[PDB]
Design a protein around this ligand. Structure first.
Ligand SMILES: Nc1ncnc2c1ncn2[C@@H]1O[C@H](COP(=O)(O)OP(=O)(O)OP(=O)(O)O)[C@@H](O)[C@H]1O
Length: 380
């Protein structure tokens, strides 16, 4: 008895949970009213452990933990790990051959956590979110991973499940889950599917073939350090220079001011996917002074155009590695929150000479959606 099996997208930056109920997939909102949840943990000075939006919205930069998915299932001496820790503000140390996260959990008490223990906290939050919606406990889940994840990374994701009290019944590839959300597994004959996935921290392109309901990952590419976070940073750098020019003041001296500008930049960015201008407003921004500025859609695109254009090179490379040309692609699936950007949508369509991609499922929810589709059949 597996009860009601949940489908979970465990994201580098944002996670999402769905279930199959009364004949369809439902994407579940968390206790803050959001259908996606930051993959973030924080420990307050009083010793409270925060998870999700409360963790990300909080200033404790050494004792905030995020990007665990970059570390999960890897050894300490993995060259990728050694590069990434240069950029993470929290302490990472070697322990039992692995990169354990070290933080102060309250009142000067130091604790170390395996990356899978951090991911377990996130999964626990996703579990609670499902249980609140369902009105009952859940014991089992379908969880997704990037198609390039290896044996140790897959097993470590299962182990995160176990720690969180979830039996991870199936590990499914993220681009496959997206395809399933769009019903593409129920096609006759052979098709080639290009999945274009641009999230918060990472960019993944995958070529899948489908043949009577069975998926094969033929080639993968992308950039592990390109995503919407990089678009926010370009906008931050823009307004920081503008503020310096207007006042003579460098706002990078006050971290919490930057933290505020970041929160508002991300919010505005998202508004510009459906409006042409957005206003950024921050009370007592720096040295008691107010910040009020507008950002247009055209300027957001100017600031990021090189980064947007850079996404096409890995698409070209997966086609080469798969020995296919553009006209061989039968379906284009846009995945990830950043694919909500009009210019990203335009660029992909142009690359494929006017071919419309699949549409109808929010792109930051599609991976969890497909996971939920499989979980529904497993619930019976
Ligand atoms: N309407 C929008 N317009 C522009 N960007 C958006 C919009 N909605 C969400 N985003 C961005 O999507 C990004 C998060 O994407 P997603 O939810 O796919 O994360 P993820 O699954 O954790 O991906 P990754 O693991 O690659 O970080 C953030 O940069 C967020 O600001």
């Amino acid at each position: 008895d597996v009860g009601t099996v949940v489908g979970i997208d465990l994201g580098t930056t944002y996670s999402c949970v769905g279930v199959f109920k009364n004949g369809r997939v439902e994407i579940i909102a968390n206790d803050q009213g959001n259908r996606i949840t930051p993959s973030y943990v924080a420990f307050t000075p009083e010793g409270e452990r925060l998870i999700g939006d409360a963790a990300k919205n909080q200033s404790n930069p050494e004792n905030t933990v995020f990007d665990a998915k970059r570390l999960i299932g890897r050894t300490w001496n993995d060259p990728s790990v050694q590069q990434d820790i240069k950029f993470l503000p929290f302490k990472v140390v070697e322990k039992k051959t692995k990169p354990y996260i070290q933080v102060d959990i309250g009142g000067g008490q130091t604790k170390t956590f395996a990356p899978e223990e951090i991911s377990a906290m996130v999964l626990t939050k996703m579990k609670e979110t499902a249980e609140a919606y369902l009105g009952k406990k859940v014991t089992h889940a379908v969880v997704t991973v990037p198609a390039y994840f290896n044996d140790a990374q897959r097993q470590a994701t299962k182990d995160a499940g176990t720690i969180a009290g979830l039996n991870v019944m199936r590990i499914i590839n993220e681009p496959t889950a997206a395809a399933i959300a769009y019903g593409l597994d129920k096609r006759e004959g052979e098709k080639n599917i290009l999945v274009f996935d641009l999230g918060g921290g990472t960019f993944d392109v995958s070529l899948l073939t489908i043949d009577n309901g069975v998926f094969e990952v033929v080639a993968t590419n992308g950039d592990t350090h390109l995503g919407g976070e990089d678009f926010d940073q370009r906008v931050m750098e823009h307004f920081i220079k503008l503020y310096k020019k207007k006042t003579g003041k460098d706002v990078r001296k006050d971290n919490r001011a930057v933290q505020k500008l970041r929160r508002e930049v991300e919010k505005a960015k998202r508004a510009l996917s459906s409006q042409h201008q957005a206003r950024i407003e921050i009370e007592s921004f720096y040295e008691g002074e107010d910040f009020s500025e507008t950002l247009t859609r055209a300027k957001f695109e100017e600031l990021n155009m090189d980064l947007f254009r850079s996404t096409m090179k890995p698409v070209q490379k997966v086609l080469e590695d798969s020995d296919l040309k553009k006209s061989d692609i039968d379906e284009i699936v846009l995945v990830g929150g950043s694919t909500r950007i009009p210019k990203i949508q335009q660029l992909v369509k142009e690359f494929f000479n006017g071919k419309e991609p699949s549409r109808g499922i929010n792109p930051d929810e599609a991976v969890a959606y497909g996971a939920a589709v499989q979980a529904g059949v497993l619930s019976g």
